Amino acid sequence: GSAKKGATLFKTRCLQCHTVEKGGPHKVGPNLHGIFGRHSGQAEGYSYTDANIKKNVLWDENNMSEYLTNPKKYIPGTKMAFGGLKKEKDRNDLITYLKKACE
Amino acid sequence: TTPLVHVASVEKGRSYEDFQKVYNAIALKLREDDEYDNYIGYGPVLVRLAWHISGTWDKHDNTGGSYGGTYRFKKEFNDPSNAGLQNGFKFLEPIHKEFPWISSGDLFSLGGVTAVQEMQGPKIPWRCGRVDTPEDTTPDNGRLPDADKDAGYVRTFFQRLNMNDREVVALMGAHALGKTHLKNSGYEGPYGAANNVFTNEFYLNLLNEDWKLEKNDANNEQWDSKSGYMMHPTDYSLIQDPKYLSIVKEYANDQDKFFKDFSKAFEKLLENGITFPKDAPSPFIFKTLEEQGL
Ligand code: HEM
Ligand code: HEM
The missing domain is CATH 1.10.420.10 (Peroxidase, domain 2)
Known part of the structure; x- marks a missing residue:
């Protein structure tokens, strides 16, 4: 994908909830640092929902595209109020941007 | 004196599936032009546009409202409290060319209903039969x-x-x-x-x-x-x-x-000032793109 347009998508459709850095801001959504192996959620006092905890799913490139295409369809009852990346070109542009900021 | 009574005449030869084609045309362009207003979309602006046209109503003399759809005229088009709604107007402009039979009042109202359902909101029943009216019935500025x-x-x-x-x-x-x-x-x-x-x-x-x-x-x-x-x-x-x-x-x-x-x-808001007969059908409940497999 394109890691430079993914910076634009994340700043406009994700930064008001999530911050991929090092701390734990947890504005509305949890932090997305080190999204390689987390399955359901993380243990940092962040009150998740019993929607994503059910049936742990490794955060891979192919399944997050399913999650960012339709969030509630992929996880029924998720608190993340997001419309969805209905396109696949910008879905590859964004996931390319996330994986580079998880070191 | 008597007040004005705006009767709702359904469009000639127009069924539920015909308006569903206008909903899908609106809902799709919402998905295509995804980068508007820094990737907010035309969703919110189409809701505010629907409210402002319904907000000029006045129950005391039954003037204004979404019935006439007089937003096409320059009088209420350049209100100081209506700046920024031109984007929702030119959003629906190509759609009004695709379906020249629909009334501007119905298009303006359907756009807001479409935006709420497509933005994962509750289903809003919708009626048809709004009629276009001349320029002398355009509401004055300041009713918002x-x-x-x-x-x-x-x-x-x-x-x-x-x-x-x-x-x-x-x-x-x-x-x-x-x-x-x-x-x-x-x-x-x-x-x-x-x-x-x-x-x-x-x-x-x-x-x-x-x-x-x-x-x-x-x-x-x-x-x-x-x-x-x-x-x-x-x-x-x-x-x-x-x-x-x-x-x-x-x-x-x-x-x-x-x-x-x-x-x-919100349905009452969009239907204010419209007198429906008894032959009018039940209010429609359109299907969202997600329910249609998209
Ligand atoms: C809030 C307004 C918001 C937006 C716009 C958004 C978009 C993107 N997210 Fe997300 N997210 C939340 C908020 C928002 N997100 C919330 C709240 C959650 C938690 C929901 C819950 O069930 O607890 C949330 C979750 C995620 C996840 C899953 C993380 C995990 O399971 O541990 C991911 C991967 C995620 C990322 C994104 C991206 C990318 C967005 C937009 C480009 N959010
Ligand atoms: C007294 C009540 C209200 C007042 C004074 C008011 C005023 C405003 C103002 C000043 C804006 C800014 C528009 C811009 O900067 O472009 C706005 C935006 C908006 N309004 Fe209202 N509003 C009211 C109620 C409502 C209602 C009832 C609705 C819908 C049913 C609504 C829908 C919207 C939406 C969706 C926006 C966002 C527009 C955008 O993002 O461009 N508002 N409102």
């Missing part, structure tokens, strides 16, 4: 509310729209969608975290976040949050009033009731 007012101004303005306290607090929950623009209305900042997703966050971040009355770059005073949110005075006044607060706290702890109450209030 002011952003810098009080809860007393809120309740007094919505009596002219014939809506009680419960319907007002419901319709305000739609303001968690979109963003205020300095170049348009004199207030800057976004309303909520989900810019284009219909949720009850308007009631949550109003009661949970910390608000301070700050000053923006237009000398206007607005209520800003510690998380980046902001509302206008006419909004923040809802919690200054005890009767509104009892409804704000109800919609904040129970989203299901806020969704059911919004539909009836």
